[PDB]
Design a protein around this ligand. Sequence first.
Ligand code: NA
Length: 130
Amino acid sequence: KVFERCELARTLKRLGMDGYRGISLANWMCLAKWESGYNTRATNYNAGDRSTDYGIFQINSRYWCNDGKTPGAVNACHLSCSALLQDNIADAVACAKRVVRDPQGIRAWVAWRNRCQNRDVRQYVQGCGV
Ligand code: NA
């Protein structure tokens, strides 16, 4: 599914993302926007290293979820990558929280650096009641 902006903001708040490991809600929103356009079924194959990015947060099969076909991969969220293509985002949120528990934090996603870091990100949550 493709969330509307404020619908996702309210959903993420209920799921405990606001301030998780120091990361504001507006930063999570900015990341989902630039990774997937708020689309849970989004996938991107990376032909250069044979891994695939999955779902609303584009989580990578080399480190985070298992898809069987990625060489040298681990599965730190302990999920099939299929779990990250569901319309219900509970598992993908649980996996995103595991990602930012490593030292890099939100910097793990290069699009956060290019598109969100040191910007005015208030725009993503304005008017949503969160
Ligand atoms: Na994996």
